[PDB]
C-alpha cells in the first residue's frame, strides 16, 4: 500500500545510518564503559555541593486532593482533607496507599 511505501520512504529519508559522516575520525573508538552514572562519577572522586536543605515549618496538604489537610491518618500515614477522603483512604486497594506516599516520595517498603 502506497501509505506504507510512503512511510518507508520517509523512514529512509530520516535515517542517519545510511550517511557516511565524513567529519568523523574513523580511528577513534571510545571506551565502552564510558557511560558511567552520576552516582559512580561522584563515588570515583574518593561542585554538586550546591544543594540547600530547609528548616522552615512545613505546611500539610491532602495526599488525595492536595487541599490543606488538618488530619493525619495513623493507619495509612496519609494526610487527608475531610472524612469523605478518610473513607476513600481506608477503602483503597491493597497497594494504593504506598503509591500516594510515593508521590510525596515517602516510602515504607
Amino acid at each position: 500500500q502506497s501509505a506504507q511505501a510512503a512511510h518507508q520512504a520517509l523512514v529512509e529519508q530520516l535515517d542517519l545510518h545510511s550517511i557516511h559522516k565524513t567529519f568523523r575520525n574513523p580511528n577513534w573508538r571510545p571506551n565502552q564503559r564510558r557511560n558511567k552514572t552520576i552516582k559512580a562519577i561522584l563515588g570515583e572522586s574518593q561542585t554538586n555541593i550546591e544543594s540547600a536543605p530547609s528548616l522552615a515549618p512545613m505546611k500539610h496538604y491532602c495526599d488525595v486532593t492536595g487541599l490543606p489537610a488538618p488530619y493525619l491518618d495513623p493507619k495509612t500515614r496519609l494526610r487527608y482533607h475531610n472524612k469523605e477522603i478518610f473513607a476513600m483512604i481506608r477503602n483503597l486497594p491493597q497497594g494504593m496507599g504506598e503509591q500516594f506516599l510515593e508521590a510525596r516520595g515517602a516510602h515504607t517498603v
Partner: protein, 447 residues
C-alpha cells in the same frame, strides 16, 4: 440543578511530542560561514537537556532545536539498521535513549550524545574545522567535561572549544551588569549571584527541581487521581504539554487552594483534555471526589467521550508551587526558591567581604531565565516573596529575560568570538597538553 444550567464543557485535545517534517542539511549556513571574516565564526551549541540548540554565531537564532535523544534499531523486516537522533525519532518504534541522566543537567549516555552531535553537524551542512562554543551545566562534573572534550577533539577534530553556562549567557545578553540570576530549567533550578559581570559560583545554589520534575510529578498525580484506571495511555510527554498550557503560579496559594474545589465556579477552574477515544439525598452532587475527578457535571461511564478525559483542578496550581514549597508538596526536602534567594541576599552577599553595596546592588536586578520560569505570575510571586524578606523600601526589581528559552543561545552566539571568549578558547594542542578536565576560567563558565 446547576449542572443542567451550565453550558457544554470546552475540551482541549491532548498534545504530545511528535515528528512534523524532515529538515535537509542547511548548505547556505556552511556557505555563509566561509564568507565571514577570519576568527569570527563559531558553531554555537546550547546543549540543553530539553533541546539541543545549534547554529552559527553570526546568526540571530539557532538553526536546529532537537531533543537529546537517539533511536537505533535493526528492522527485522528489512535486515538493515536504522538510526535517528532528534525529532526524526518521533518523540515510530521509539527505542529511545537519552543523553542525559533523567532529572539532571549532566550528560551520561555518551553514545546518544555522540549521535546527537553527528546529527547537529550533518544538518549544519558540514562535510569535509570550526570553533565550537558549548554550554555546560553549572558545576558540570569533571569526568563529564572530559568525555565531551574527548568527543569534540578526538572524534570531530574541532580546532577550539569553550564551555559556558546557559544561565549566564542569557544574563549578559540582557545587559546584565550585576544581579541575582534565577534560572529554572528542564533539568534544575539555579540561583546565581553575578557581581561585575562575573558569577560568584561559590555562592550559587541548585534546587533539583525543574520542568522535567514537574512533568513527572504531574504524571504521578494524574495516575493517582484516576487510579481506578484511566483508559488512555498517560505519558509524561503529554503532562509536559499540560504543565505548559494550563499550570500557573498562585499569587496566594493557601487562600486560592482552600476554595479551589468549591462547586460554585469550578466550571472554569477546571480544564479538560480529551484523549482520542475509539468511538463505538446524599449523592455525587454533594461529594468532593466527584468535583475533584469530574467537576460540576454528572458523569457516566457509558460515554466514551466522557471517559478518556482528565480534569486538572488543583494541579493547575499545585504543580508550579513545588518550586516554592518543595518539602511540603513533593517531599523534595530542600529550601524553596524564595528561601534560597533570600538566604543568598540576606546572609551570604553581605557577609562576603570582597563585595560592595550588597545586597542593594543585586536587588536592582533579580533576573529570570529558562523555560520553566515562563509560568504566569512567576515574577510577581517571586517579587512579593523577596519583598517580605528585604528591608523596607529596598529597590527590589524582578525582570524576565526576553525570549527566555532561545536567549541563552543568543548570549553564547554574541559572546562566541569576542576577545574575552577567544582568550577562553582551548585549542586541540592545549587539550593534548592538558587533557579535557582543564578549562580557561572566565566570567561565564565554571571554575
Amino acid at each position: 440543578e446547576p449542572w443542567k444550567r451550565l453550558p457544554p464543557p470546552t475540551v482541549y485535545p491532548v498534545k504530545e511530542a511528535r515528528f512534523e517534517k524532515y529538515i535537509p542539511p542547511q548548505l547556505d549556513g556552511r556557505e555563509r560561514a566561509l564568507a565571514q571574516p577570519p576568527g569570527q565564526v563559531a558553531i554555537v551549541i546550547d546543549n540543553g537537556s530539553h533541546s539541543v540548540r545549534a547554529g552559527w554565531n553570526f546568526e540571530d537564532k539557532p538553526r536546529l532545536a532537537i531533543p537529546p535523544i537517539m533511536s537505533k534499531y535493526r528492522d527485522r523486516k528489512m535486515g538493515k539498521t536504522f538510526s535517528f537522533a532528534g525529532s526524526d525519532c518521533y518523540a515510530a518504534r521509539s527505542h529511545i535513549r537519552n543523553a542525559f541522566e533523567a532529572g539532571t543537567g549532566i550528560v551520561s549516555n555518551w553514545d546518544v550524545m555522540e549521535h546527537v552531535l553527528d546529527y547537529v553537524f550533518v544538518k549544519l551542512g558540514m562535510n569535509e574545522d570550526m570553533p565550537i562554543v558549548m554550554t555546560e551545566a553549572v558545576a558540570n562534573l569533571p569526568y563529564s567535561r572530559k568525555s565531551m572534550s574527548e568527543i569534540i577533539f578526538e572524534c570531530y577534530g574541532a580546532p577550539s572549544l569553550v564551555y559556558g553556562i546557559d544561565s549566564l549567557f542569557s544574563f549578559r545578553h540582557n545587559q546584565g551588569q550585576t544581579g541575582l540570576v534565577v534560572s529554572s530549567s528542564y533539568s534544575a533550578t539555579h540561583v546565581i549571584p553575578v557581581y561585575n559581570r562575573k558569577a560568584l559560583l561559590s555562592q550559587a545554589i541548585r534546587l533539583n527541581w525543574g520542568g522535567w520534575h514537574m512533568a513527572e510529578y504531574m504524571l504521578k498525580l494524574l495516575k493517582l487521581k484516576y487510579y481506578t484506571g484511566f483508559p488512555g495511555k498517560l505519558n509524561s510527554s503529554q503532562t509536559e504539554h499540560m504543565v505548559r498550557d494550563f499550570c500557573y503560579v498562585s499569587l496566594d496559594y493557601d487562600r486560592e487552594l482552600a476554595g479551589y474545589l468549591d462547586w460554585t465556579g469550578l466550571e472554569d477552574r477546571e480544564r479538560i483534555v480529551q484523549y482520542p477515544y475509539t468511538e463505538e439525598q446524599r449523592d455525587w452532587s454533594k461529594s468532593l471526589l466527584h468535583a475533584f475527578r469530574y467537576g460540576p457535571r454528572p458523569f457516566d461511564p457509558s460515554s466514551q467521550a466522557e471517559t478518556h478525559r482528565v480534569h486538572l483542578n488543583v494541579e493547575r496550581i499545585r504543580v508550579p508551587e513545588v518550586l516554592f514549597q518543595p518539602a511540603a508538596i513533593a517531599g523534595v526536602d530542600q529550601a524553596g526558591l524564595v528561601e534560597i534567594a533570600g538566604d543568598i541576599l540576606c546572609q551570604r552577599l553581605p557577609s562576603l567581604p570582597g563585595i560592595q553595596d550588597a545586597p542593594d546592588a543585586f536587588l536592582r536586578d533579580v533576573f529570570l531565565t529558562g523555560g520553566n520560569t515562563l509560568f504566569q505570575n512567576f515574577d510577581e510571586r517571586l517579587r512579593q516573596g523577596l519583598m517580605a524578606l528585604l528591608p523596607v523600601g529596598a529597590p527590589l526589581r524582578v525582570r524576565r529575560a526576553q525570549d527566555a528559552i532561545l536567549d541563552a543561545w543568543r548570549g553564547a552566539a554574541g559572546w562566541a568570538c569576542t576577545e574575552e571568549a577567544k582568550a577562553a578558547w582551548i585549542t586541540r594542542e592545549e587539550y593534548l597538553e592538558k587533557g579535557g578536565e582543564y578549562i580557561k576560567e572566565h566570567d561565564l563558565g565554571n571554575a
